[PDB]
Amino acid sequence: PYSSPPTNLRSLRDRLTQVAERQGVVFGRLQRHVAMIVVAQFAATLTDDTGAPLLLVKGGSSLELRRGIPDSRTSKAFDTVARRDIELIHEQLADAGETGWEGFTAIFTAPEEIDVPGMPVKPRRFTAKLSYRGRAFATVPIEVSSVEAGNADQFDTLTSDALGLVGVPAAVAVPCMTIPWQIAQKLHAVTAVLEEPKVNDRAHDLVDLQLLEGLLLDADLMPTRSACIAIFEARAQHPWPPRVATLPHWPLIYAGALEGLDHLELARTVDAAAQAVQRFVARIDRAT
Numbered sequence: 001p002y003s004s005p006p007t008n009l010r011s012l013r014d015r016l017t018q019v020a021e022r023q024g025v026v027f028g029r030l031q032r033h034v035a036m037i038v039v040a041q042f043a044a045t046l047t048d049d050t051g052a053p054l055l056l057v058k059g060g061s062s063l064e065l066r067r068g069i070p071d072s073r074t075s076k077a078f079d080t081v082a083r084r085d086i087e088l089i090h091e092q093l094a095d096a097g098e099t100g101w102e103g104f105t106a107i108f109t110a111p112e113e114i115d116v117p118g119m120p121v122k123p124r125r126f127t128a129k130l131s132y133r134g135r136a137f138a139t140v141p142i143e144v145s146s147v148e149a150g151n152a153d154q155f156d157t158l159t160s161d162a163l164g165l166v167g168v169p170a171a172v173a174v175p176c177m178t179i180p181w182q183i184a185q186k187l188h189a190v191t192a193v194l195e196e197p198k199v200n201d202r203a204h205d206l207v208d209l210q211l212l213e214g215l216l217l218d219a220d221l222m223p224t225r226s227a228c229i230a231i232f233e234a235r236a237q238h239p240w241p242p243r244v245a246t247l248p249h250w251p252l253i254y255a256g257a258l259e260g261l262d263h264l265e266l267a268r269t270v271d272a273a274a275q276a277v278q279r280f281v282a283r284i285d286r287a288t
């Protein structure tokens, strides 16, 4: 246990290395995780007139927070749903990063519209360039999506002790989109059928959906069913409940997304994973 915060970036990295070995995770994953937590602390300063967050973490970053680095895929971005339009979010995020948090500071690049087949609204992507006490520490890709069907009306508050473990004591509170909404979105995405030149490549959703099933309590099954219906209705595309199919190019992609997750009970083949998520769909659909 450290008595005080790292005096500089060198000490922070040395401490991260120390915690990574003790925890048995890869240093670069832990460093990404810590940088994402730091970004979340800037994001958490964005609030409406009632103190409620303007930004909720979702996607792979949400799963990492809920399950831990060992039990989740590498998250590619700090992915969020936003209750305000991107220009306000960016302006307040940039101000938060300039003011800093526990010695960390951030510069945010200009947002850019992203293409993502199947979503009603194109998300915006940009980058946070984080420093620790004036030394470049890491860059965190950030993704921001519009609300959908009331998916930001509720949230959970996640915590990590990763920064405490390197001696940064402030409280971590990460507002996160709820598991029922997160299931609804991923179920829609993995079952969407794209225009025939384009093809659906989201075999990794079959991993995330198995991971989410492991988190869901039965008391939230009927909430999840309603959230699935709301998402499928709002998106005005294929109907609920969907058929969880696979495509011929998915096997290698599904195997890649499993990398490092063997200690879990995940379906070993992609077609087995599709049938397991199909069973999940049926369980959700019967919780009336």
Ligand SMILES: Nc1ccn([C@@H]2O[C@H](COP(=O)(O)OP(=O)(O)OP(=O)(O)O)[C@@H](O)[C@H]2O)c(=O)n1
Pocket: 058, 059, 060, 061, 073, 074, 075, 076, 079, 116, 117, 118, 119, 185, 186, 188, 189, 192, 204
């Ligand atoms: N048709 C789609 C595509 C994606 N998403 C949402 O956008 C997020 C980002 O998708 P992606 O870019 O593929 O990242 P992740 O799925 O979170 O994980 P990874 O990039 O590591 O594969 C997902 O979590 C999901 O909530 C969605 O709702 N519908």
